[PDB]
C-alpha cells in the first residue's frame, strides 16, 4: 500500500493539516460577547492613543 | 527436514542421548553393596535399583563413558582402587577426599560407587557434577543484597530439584528445621492468595523446604537456608561431592561481568563460594560420616594450584595467578583434604573386564575367534598403557583398525 | 617523525620574511608538517616538475605539504 517514506510524508502532512486536530467553535453568551467587545474596543482605542503619542513625538 | 526417530546429534551426544542401550543383552550380575564386598571383591557388579535411581538423578553416569554398551551402567569392585577408598572414607576422622589420577583411570566411576555406598547407608547426597555450568556464564545471575555474592537462580533450581529427587523422602523428611523461614511464593495456584510461603520450626520439614518455589531473587536465599539446615542436623549424614573440580580450581574467574565491564571472581558467586565453604572447615556438618568427595577431570586444564595444595611441590611465589591461585590452595589446606590416587588396572582385573565384555557380547570376532585368551589379554594390557580402563575399552570396541 | 612523541616533522624555511611581507615560500620539502605558525602564508610546493601555489589551509594544520601538490596527472584512456 505505502512505503515507510510515504508514511512519514503523510505524518508530516498531518502535522500541518487541520484534519481532526481542531476544537469546537468558541461560542459565547450575549453578556460575555458584550464584555469581549468592550475589552477589544477599549484596547484598540488605547493602541490608537499610543500611536498618536509616538507619532506626535 | 528432521523426524523424531532420526539421529540429528553429533556422535558423542548421540551415544549419550539416543537410547542404543535398548538393544542389549540382559545380564544377571551381582549387586553392589559395601557390607558384602568380601563376596564380590574383584567382580563386575550391576548397581541396585534404588542406587541407579539416585545415581541418575545426581548425575554420576556421564556422556563420554561407554555406558551405552550395556543394559545399565556397570562397574567392578577393586581391592586396590574402590574398596580401599571406601575403607578410608569409613575410617578417617576428617572424611574429606580429592580423587586424583590420569585421564580415563576411573575417577567418576569411583564417585558413582561412593554415591551408591552413601545411598545404601542412609545418607543424603548433594552432588555437583559439572561445575562448568555455574562457573561458565550460560545462565541467569543476580547480585543479592542480603548475601554479599552473585546468585544463579536457573542452576540453583536444578540443583535443588536434583537434591530432592536423588534422595529418598523418608530419610529427608526425618529432619525438623532449626529456624523459621519466609519465602516469596511462585506457584501457578494461589498467586493472589499466596504471595508468601512460611515454614515453621518444629512442624515443617527439610523436604517441604526443598519443595518451596520462589522468584529468582529468593532462590539463592532458599539455597542458603537449606545448606544451613543440613549443617545443623545430626540425624543423617550429608555426602557432598563435586566432580570436574579441576575446572573450578583453574577457572578462578567466571565469565560473568558485573556492572563495570570486568570478570566476576568464583568466590564472589553464591555457588562457588558455598562449595569452597563446604570444602573448608567452615560450614561444618553436625553429624559424623558427613563427607566431601571431590574429583579431578583430565578434560580440564592443569596448573600448579592443585599440586601445591597437596603434598607435591613447594610453593613457588612468582608463578602467575593464571597458573597458580594461592587463595584456593589456602582454602584446601584449611579443610584437611587427603588426596586419593586412583591406581591403574592390574592384569587380573583387565582379564575380568574382558571376560565380562565377552559375556555381554561387546568383543569383536577377530579378538574372540582364532586367538589365545591370555595373549589377547596381554595385548589389551599393552595397548591400554598397562591398564587405563577407558583406553582399554576404546581399544576393545572403538578401534576397528 | 610520525609518532606523536618526537613530532612534528620540522624543516628550515624562509617563514619570518614571508610573515613580514607577502613573499611566497617555494618549498621543495613535501615532507614538512604544516604548523599553526604558518596558516595564511603562501607556499609554492614542488610537484616534481612545476611549483604549485597554495595558501595554507586553517584545516591543513596536521598534514604534509606534499599532500597538496599531486605529482601524477589524472589518468585517462584514448578510446581508439
Amino acid at each position: 500500500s505505502l512505503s515507510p517514506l510515504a508514511q512519514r510524508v503523510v505524518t508530516q502532512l498531518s502535522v500541518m493539516s487541520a484534519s481532526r486536530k481542531q476544537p469546537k467553535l468558541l461560542k459565547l453568551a450575549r453578556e460575555d460577547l458584550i464584555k469581549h467587545q468592550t475589552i477589544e474596543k477599549c484596547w484598540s482605542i488605547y493602541q490608537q492613543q499610543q500611536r498618536e503619542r509616538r507619532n506626535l513625538q | 527436514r528432521v523426524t523424531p526417530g532420526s539421529l540429528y546429534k553429533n556422535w558423542t551426544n548421540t551415544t549419550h542421548t539416543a537410547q542404543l542401550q535398548q538393544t542389549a543383552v540382559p545380564l544377571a550380575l551381582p549387586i553392589f553393596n559395601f557390607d558384602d564386598i568380601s563376596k564380590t571383591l574383584n567382580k563386575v557388579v550391576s548397581y541396585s535399583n534404588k542406587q541407579y535411581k539416585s545415581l541418575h538423578h545426581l548425575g554420576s553416569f556421564k556422556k563420554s563413558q561407554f555406558n551405552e554398551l550395556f543394559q545399565k551402567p556397570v562397574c567392578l569392585v577393586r581391592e586396590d582402587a574402590t574398596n580401599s577408598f571406601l575403607k578410608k572414607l569409613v575410617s578417617h576422622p576428617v572424611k574429606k577426599f580429592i580423587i586424583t589420577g590420569e585421564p580415563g583411570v576411573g575417577k567418576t566411576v569411583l564417585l558413582s560407587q561412593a554415591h551408591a555406598y552413601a545411598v545404601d547407608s542412609k545418607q543424603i547426597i548433594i552432588n555437583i557434577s559439572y561445575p562448568e555450568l555455574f562457573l561458565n556464564g550460560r545462565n541467569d545471575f543476580s547480585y543479592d543484597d542480603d548475601l554479599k555474592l552473585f546468585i544463579q537462580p536457573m542452576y540453583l533450581k536444578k540443583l535443588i530439584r536434583k537434591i530432592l529427587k536423588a534422595n529418598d523422602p523418608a530419610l529427608l523428611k526425618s529432619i525438623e528445621l532449626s529456624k523459621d523461614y519466609k519465602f516469596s511464593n511462585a506457584n501457578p495456584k494461589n498467586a493472589s492468595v499466596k504471595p508468601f510461603v512460611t515454614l515453621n520450626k518444629t512442624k515443617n520439614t527439610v523436604l517441604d523446604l526443598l519443595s518451596v518455589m520462589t522468584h529468582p531473587h529468593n532462590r539463592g536465599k532458599l539455597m542458603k537456608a537449606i545448606i544451613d539446615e543440613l549443617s545443623v542436623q545430626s540425624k543423617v549424614p550429608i555426602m557432598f561431592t563435586v566432580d570436574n573440580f579441576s575446572k573450578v580450581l583453574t577457572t578462578a574467574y567466571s565469565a560473568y561481568r558485573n556492572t563495570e565491564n570486568k570478570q566476576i571472581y568464583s568466590l564472589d558467586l553464591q555457588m562457588g563460594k558455598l562449595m569452597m565453604d563446604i570444602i573448608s572447615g567452615e560450614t561444618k556438618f553436625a553429624n559424623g560420616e558427613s563427607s566431601t568427595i571431590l574429583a579431578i577431570s583430565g578434560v580440564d586444564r592443569t596448573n600448579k594450584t592443585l599440586p601445591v595444595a597437596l603434598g607435591k611441590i613447594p610453593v613457588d611465589p612468582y608463578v602467575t595467578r593464571y597458573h597458580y591461585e594461592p587463595k584456593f590452595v589456602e582454602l584446601l589446606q584449611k579443610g584437611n583434604v587427603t588426596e586419593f590416587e586412583v591406581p591403574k588396572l592390574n592384569k587380573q582385573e583387565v582379564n575380568e573386564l574382558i571376560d565380562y565384555y565377552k559375556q555381554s557380547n561387546v568383543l569383536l570376532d577377530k579378538d574372540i575367534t582364532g586367538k589365545k585368551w591370555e595373549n589377547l589379554i596381554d595385548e589389551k594390557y599393552f595397548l591400554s598403557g598397562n591398564g587405563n580402563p577407558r583406553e582399554l575399552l576404546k581399544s576393545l570396541v572403538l578401534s576397528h583398525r | 617523525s610520525r609518532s606523536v612523541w618526537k613530532g612534528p616533522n620540522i624543516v628550515p624555511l624562509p617563514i619570518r620574511e614571508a610573515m613580514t611581507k607577502g613573499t611566497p615560500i617555494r618549498t621543495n620539502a613535501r615532507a614538512a608538517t604544516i604548523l599553526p605558525q604558518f596558516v595564511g602564508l603562501k607556499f609554492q610546493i614542488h610537484n616534481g616538475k612545476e611549483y604549485v601555489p597554495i595558501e595554507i589551509s586553517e584545516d591543513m594544520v596536521g598534514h604534509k605539504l606534499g599532500e597538496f601538490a599531486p605529482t601524477r596527472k589524472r589518468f585517462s584512456y584514448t578510446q581508439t
Binding site: 510515504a6 510524508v9 503523510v10 502532512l13 500541518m16 487541520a18 484534519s19 481542531q22 467553535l25 | - | 606523536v4 612523541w5 613530532g7 612534528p8 620540522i10 624543516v11 628550515p12 624555511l13 624562509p14 617563514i15 619570518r16 620574511e17 615560500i25 617555494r26 604548523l35 599553526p36 605558525q37 596558516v39 586553517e58 584545516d59 591543513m60 594544520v61 596536521g62 598534514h63
Partner: protein, 93 residues
C-alpha cells in the same frame, strides 16, 4: 516515474466556516551563549533550550567585545615566537 501521493476527494470547506490554522505552540525559553534568556513561541515540545553558538558570542555581532585544535592537543607536551625564530633560516628559498 514521478513519485507522488495520489489525492483523495477534497473536503468541502463551506464559505464562512473556514477556520484559521492555530497550531499548537509552547512558550520556549532560549538562554543564549551568555545568560540572557528570551521567550519564544515554538511548535516543538521543549520548555528550555540553552544555545552554544549565537550572535552574543560571535565576533561579527560584537567586534568591540578542528584540525589545528587536534594538532594542539597531540603536540601539547612539547609546547611547539621563540619556536618560529629557532626554525626560520631565510637563506634557502
Amino acid at each position: 516515474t514521478r513519485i507522488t501521493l495520489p489525492r483523495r476527494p477534497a473536503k468541502k470547506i463551506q464559505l464562512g466556516k473556514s477556520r484559521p490554522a492555530i497550531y499548537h505552540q509552547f512558550n520556549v525559553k532560549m538562554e543564549l551563549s551568555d545568560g540572557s534568556v528570551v521567550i519564544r513561541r515554538s511548535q516543538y515540545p521543549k520548555g528550555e533550550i540553552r544555545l552554544i553558538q549565537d550572535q552574543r558570542n560571535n565576533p561579527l555581532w560584537n567586534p568591540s567585545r578542528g584540525s589545528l585544535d587536534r594538532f594542539n592537543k597531540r603536540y601539547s607536551s612539547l609546547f611547539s615566537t621563540v619556536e618560529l625564530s629557532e626554525e626560520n633560516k631565510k637563506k634557502t628559498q
